């Protein structure tokens, strides 16, 4: 069952359409005192400029 | 309607959790019935999923977990203009001098 | 590492499975639940800041192999606390608690060359006196040792390798 298990997982995940971000994209998950935590951005690089809605920028530090 | 619920109370700090479609913004004002009375909370931080940390603008005693909380979708906003001359008001713009309603046009 | 936060859930699930005789079904249920946690697309979701009940209900959907009441209730309890990544360890500690309750052991025998299948019988018989448990050997071949045998049973080892003897003599001097 070891392999048909993984196949059934991939099948059912595609079915219920849980999905991962694009690599150049993410979503804000917290906001506080001037700092935001973003989830995703697999290809953000330290010091990069992230563009927010409303034509504003955030600087990736952590 | 009242979409939120209290999930913690620690002194003056109250945590409220909303459905993730309708999380209040920062500095928004919420409102809860603290017994036979009304209490407004000011959102300070959006932390985690649907949960929001706030400061109570009043005595925190008597708050249960699970009370229904309603979000006024705007910051704390106060009366302004000529109507306020000669009146005393608290931080929320409510009269504390017993002379009755303010009579303001604009907030 | 989730070794310490897995202990409560492992013990609770094992007690529950014992009462209802379904230990062998619970182990399969946990194996599958641990397998869905390793998936590339799900391990992304589990890291997000979704609300617990939403994460549980979107995780429950990916598993019809769970007995609908209790196997899902375990997932819900774990999701409340934010511990769904602990499943691959709840599984191993469940297996360990089972092996304890069924008084079974699994001892590795490491040798320079395979044994005669008459030697193995003697080793297993002797260990079943070293231990109260019914043993299951899994012999292996290693070229670093070059004579004798290593018997490793849990975290107790009995070392009779010539390699060990050499490097234990060198220190006497």
Give this entry's resolution in angstroms: 3.1
CB B39 within 8 A of CB B61: no
Question: Which residues span the domain enclosing A49?
Answer: 1-62
CB A17 within 8 A of CB A10: no
Picking from A20, A40, A21, A18, the residue whose alpha carbon sits closest to that of residue A29 is A40
Largest CA distance in chain B: 45
CATH class belonging to C2-100: mainly alpha
Report the DSSP pairing between strands C134-141 and C104-111: parallel
For tokens 């004002």, name the residue.
B29
| Other CB atoms within 10 Å distance of the CB of residue A57 | 9
Q: What is the C-alpha separation between B66 and B59, in angstroms, rounded?
A: 18
CB C123 within 8 A of CB C79: no
| Other CB atoms within 10 Å distance of the CB of residue C106 | 14
Report the DSSP pairing between strands B28-33 and B38-46: antiparallel
Structure tokens at C97: 């608690």
DSSP state of C133: S
For tokens 């034509």, name the residue.
A55
Q: What is the C-alpha separation between C94 and C90, in angstroms, rounded?
A: 6
Q: Which residues pair with A12 in a beta bridge?
A: none
Neighbouring C-alpha atoms within 13 Å toward the C-beta of B54: 36
Radius of gyration from C-alpha coordinates of chain C: 21
Kindly give the interhelix angle for C23-37 and C40-47, rounded to the nearest 10 degrees: 80
Q: What is the C-alpha separation between A31 and B45, in angstroms, rounded?
A: 6
Radius of gyration from C-alpha coordinates of chain A: 17
Residues in Cβ contact with C43 at an 8 Å cutoff, skipping those fewer than 6 apart: C37, C85
- Put simply, the answer to whether A13 touches C62 (Cβ < 8 Å) is yes
CB A37 within 8 A of CB A44: no
Q: Which of A27, A30, A39 to mutate to test the interface with B (most CBs of B within 10 A)?
A: A30
For tokens 């109260």, name the residue.
C132
Please name the method used to determine this structure. cryo-EM
Structure tokens at C123: 């080793």
Report the DSSP pairing between strands C149-153 and C104-111: antiparallel
Interface of B with C in 56-95 (CB under 8 A): none
Where helices occur in chain A by DSSP H, the ranges are 2-16
- Put simply, the answer to whether C49 touches B49 (Cβ < 8 Å) is yes
Q: What is the C-alpha separation between A33 and B47, in angstroms, rounded?
A: 11
For tokens 């699970």, name the residue.
B66
Structure tokens at B102: 């303010």
Q: Which residues pair with C146 in a beta bridge?
A: none
CB B67 within 8 A of CB B30: no
End-to-end CA separation in angstroms for chain B: 23
Q: What is the C-alpha separation between C69 and C49, in angstroms, rounded?
A: 26
Residues in Cβ contact with C49 at an 8 Å cutoff, skipping those fewer than 6 apart: A29, A30, A39, B48, B49
CB C137 within 8 A of CB C120: yes
- Put simply, the answer to whether B48 touches C54 (Cβ < 8 Å) is no
CB C92 within 8 A of CB C59: no
A30/B contact by beta carbon, under 8 A: yes
DSSP state of B85: T
User: What CATH number did the domain enclosing A60 receive?
Assistant: 2.40.30.20
Q: What is the C-alpha separation between C122 and C104, in angstroms, rounded?
A: 18
B51: helix, strand or coil:
strand
CB C6 within 8 A of CB C14: no
Domain total for chain A? 1
Radius of gyration from C-alpha coordinates of chain B: 15
Q: What is the C-alpha separation between C108 and C154, in angstroms, rounded?
A: 9
For tokens 């999930």, name the residue.
B7
**CB < 8 Å to A39, chain C:** 47-49
Q: What is the C-alpha separation between C59 and C47, in angstroms, rounded?
A: 13
Report the sign of the C-alpha dihedral through residues C156, C159, C163, C167, in that order.
positive
C55: helix, strand or coil:
helix
**CB < 8 Å to C52, chain B:** 49
| Other CB atoms within 10 Å distance of the CB of residue C25 | 13
Least Cα separation, residue A28 to chain B (angstroms): 10
How do the residues of chain C divide into helix, strand and coil, expressed in percent and rounded to 5?
60, 15, 25
């Amino acid at each position: 069952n070891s392999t048909e298990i993984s196949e059934l997982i991939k099948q059912r995940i595609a079915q219920f359409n849980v999905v991962s971000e694009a690599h150049n994209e993410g979503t804000i998950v917290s906001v506080s005192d001037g700092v935001i935590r973003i989830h995703g951005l697999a290809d953000c690089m330290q010091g990069e400029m992230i563009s927010l809605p409303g034509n504003r920028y955030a600087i990736a530090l952590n | 309607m009242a979409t939120g619920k209290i999930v913690q109370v620690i002194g003056a700090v109250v945590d409220v959790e909303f459905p993730q479609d309708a999380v209040p913004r920062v500095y928004d004002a919420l409102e809860v019935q603290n017994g036979n009375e009304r209490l407004v909370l000011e959102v300070q931080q959006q932390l985690g999923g649907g949960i929001v940390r706030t400061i109570a603008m009043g005595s925190s005693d008597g708050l249960r977990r699970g009370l229904d909380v309603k979000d006024l979708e705007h910051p704390i906003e106060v009366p302004v203009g000529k109507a306020t001359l000669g009146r005393i008001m608290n931080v929320l713009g409510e009269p504390v001098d017993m002379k009755g309603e303010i009579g303001e046009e604009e907030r | 590492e989730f070794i310490t936060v897995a202990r409560p859930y492992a013990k609770a699930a094992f007690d529950f499975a014992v009462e209802h005789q379904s230990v062998e079904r619970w182990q399969d249920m946990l194996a599958f639940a641990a397998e869905v946690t390793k998936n590339e697309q799900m391990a992304e979701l589990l890291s997000g800041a979704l609300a617990p009940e939403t994460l549980a209900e979107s995780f429950i959907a990916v598993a019809g192999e769970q007995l609908d009441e209790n196997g899902q209730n375990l997932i819900r309890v774990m999701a409340e606390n934010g511990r769904l990544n602990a499943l691959p360890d709840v599984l191993e500690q469940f297996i360990h608690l089972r092996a304890v309750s069924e008084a079974t052991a699994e001892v590795d025998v490491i040798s320079a060359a395979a044994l005669s299948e008459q030697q193995l019988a003697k080793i297993s018989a002797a260990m079943e006196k070293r231990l109260s448990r019914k043993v299951k050997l899994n012999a292996k071949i290693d070229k670093s040792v070059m004579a004798g045998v290593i018997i490793r049973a849990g975290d107790m080892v009995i070392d009779g390798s010539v390699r060990g003897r050499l490097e234990r003599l060198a220190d006497v001097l």
